[PDB]
Design a protein around this ligand. Structure first.
Ligand SMILES: Oc1cc(F)ccc1CNc1ncccc1-c1ncon1
Lengths: 251, 251
C-alpha cells in the first residue's frame, strides 16, 4: 500500500523547537564585519516560526563552546512528542563552516547531532536547517557578500536551505534585514500553514531571483544576482497545518 | 498578480532533449572498474523519458573531447520551441568531476553551457541534471560504491539530482542496474505524467532509503544505506503532463 501523497506525521502534542543562532559582531582577530540587520532577520523568523507552533529559542553572539553546548543540549533532550526540528544560522561562513563569535564550526558536526543514530526521538521526523551565511567582504544601505558556504546535504529526513548558491551574491538591508529571510518570512506569513514546505522554498527561490540588481546606489553592486537553493533528503510531503490547541496542554 | 501555484510553461511544440552519457568501461591507466548494469539504467531511462515526450539521445563511453563537443553542440542549437532540457551522467565521479572514458570533467563546465547568459533559448525553462556517479571501489550481484560526488547546485532554474549523498553508499545490480535509477524509472512510469517532479524525486528518496541492507550475500556490504538527494534552484512547479500531439508536427 505505497502512497505517492504520503505526508510526515505532523499531529504530535507540540510542533517542536526552532533554534536561532544570531551573529552580529565577531572577535577582533577574525577581521569579519558587523552584520547590521541580522536582528531584523532574528525577530521576523522568531515571529513566523512562533505562529506555526514552534518553541523559538534565540541565542546572540555565542562563542564556539557555548554554541556547541546549547545545540548538543537540544540534541540529547527528548523530541519524542514533537513534529520536527528547525535550526537557523545567521552568521558568516566559508565552505563546510559557519562562524561563531570566536571561530568556525563544521556544519556536518551540527547536523550530525540530529542524525538517526545520535537522536532517536527525531528519527523519521523532518530536520530543517536554514543558513544565511556568506563571506565577510570588509540609514538603510544594502550590503552584498559573495556566496561562500557549500550547499551540503545532510542525512535522511533533513532539508538544508541556503540564502545563496555558488557564483551568486547574498544581500542584507541594514534595517530590513537579509533578502533571503525577508522573502522566506513573507512566504511563511502568507502560506506557511497551507503549502508544502519545499513548494514554499521554491516561491522564495522565485522572489529572491526576481529582485532587480540593475539600478543600485553603489555601482560595484550591479549585476550581482541572488539565487538561493535547498538540498532535500526528505522522504515525504511536509506541511505546517495549524495544530488543534483547543482544550489540550502543548507546553 | 503573484501566484503561489505558478507552473513552468510546458506547452511548447516539443518537450525537449534528454542527453544520456553512459559509461561502462574506462581507459586502463585510470584503474576504474567496469559498471556492469549501466546499460539497464540507460535503456530504462531511455524508455521512461521517451514516454514523457523527450527526444532521448544516448552516447556510450565517449572520451572527454567527444563528450564536450556533443554537449556543447546541444547547448548552441536552439531550444526555443522546447519545454525543458534533461542531461544524465551514468559514470564514476569524484568531488566536482564526472569521468569520461579517458579523464575527469568539471560538472560546473557542463552545467555552465546551459546557464541563462550562454543558452538564451533555455532561459526560464527547467534544466535537470541526473547524476549516478560514485568512487570506483576495485549472475545478478549487487556492487556497492562510496558516495564521492559533491551535491552541487547550479544556477536559476536548474535541478541537480544525485544517486547518493555524502557519507552514504550507491548500489548497482549487474543485470537490473542502479538502485537510484530503478526507483527513479519506476516512479516516472507510475507518476511522471501527474506528479510535480520534486514530489516524485522525494518518492525516490523514500524508495531508495527504505531498501534493506541488513541481510546481504557479502558481509562487508551490511549497514551501507543509500540516501539520494536533489538541489533545487527551480522557481516554479514542474509537471510533465501529456502533450497534445494530435494533428500537430512535433519533430
Ligand atoms: O554550493 C557551493 C557554494 C560555494 F560557495 C562553492 C561551491 C559550492 C558547491 N560545492 C558543494 N556543494 C554541495 C555539497 C558539497 C560541496 C563541496 N564543495 C567542496 O567540497 N564540498
Amino acid at each position: 500500500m505505497f502512497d505517492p501523497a504520503e505526508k510526515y506525521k505532523m499531529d504530535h502534542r507540540r510542533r517542536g523547537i526552532a533554534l536561532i543562532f544570531n551573529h552580529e559582531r565577531f572577535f577582533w582577530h577574525l577581521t569579519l564585519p558587523e552584520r547590521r540587520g541580522t536582528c531584523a532577520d532574528r525577530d521576523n523568523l522568531t515571529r513566523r516560526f512562533s505562529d506555526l507552533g514552534f518553541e523559538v529559542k534565540c541565542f546572540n553572539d555565542l562563542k564556539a563552546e557555548e554554541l556547541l553546548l546549547k545545540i548538543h543540549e537540544v540534541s540529547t533532550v527528548s523530541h519524542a512528542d514533537a513534529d520536527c526540528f528547525v535550526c537557523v544560522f545567521l552568521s558568516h561562513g566559508e565552505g563546510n563552516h559557519i562562524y561563531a563569535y570566536d571561530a568556525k564550526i563544521e556544519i556536518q558536526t551540527l547536523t550530525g547531532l540530529f542524525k538517526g543514530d545520535k537522536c532517536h526521538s527525531l528519527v523519521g521526523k523532518p530536520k530543517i536547517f536554514i543558513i544565511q551565511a556568506a563571506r565577510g567582504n570588509q540609514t538603510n544601505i544594502t550590503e552584498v557578500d559573495a556566496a561562500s558556504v557549500y550547499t551540503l546535504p545532510a542525512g535522511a529526513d533533513f532539508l538544508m536551505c541556503y540564502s545563496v548558491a555558488e557564483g551568486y551574491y547574498s544581500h542584507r538591508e541594514t534595517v530590513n534585514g537579509s533578502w533571503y529571510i525577508q522573502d522566506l518570512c513573507e512566504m511563511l506569513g502568507k502560506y506557511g500553514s497551507s503549502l508544502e514546505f519545499t513548494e514554499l522554498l521554491t516561491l522564495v527561490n522565485r522572489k529572491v531571483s526576481q529582485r532587480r540588481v540593475d539600478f543600485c546606489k553603489d555601482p560595484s553592486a550591479i549585476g550581482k544576482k541572488q539565487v538561493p537553493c535547498f538540498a532535500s533528503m526528505l522522504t515525504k510531503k511536509l506541511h505546517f497545518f495549524p495544530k488543534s490547541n483547543e482544550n489540550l496542554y502543548f507546553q
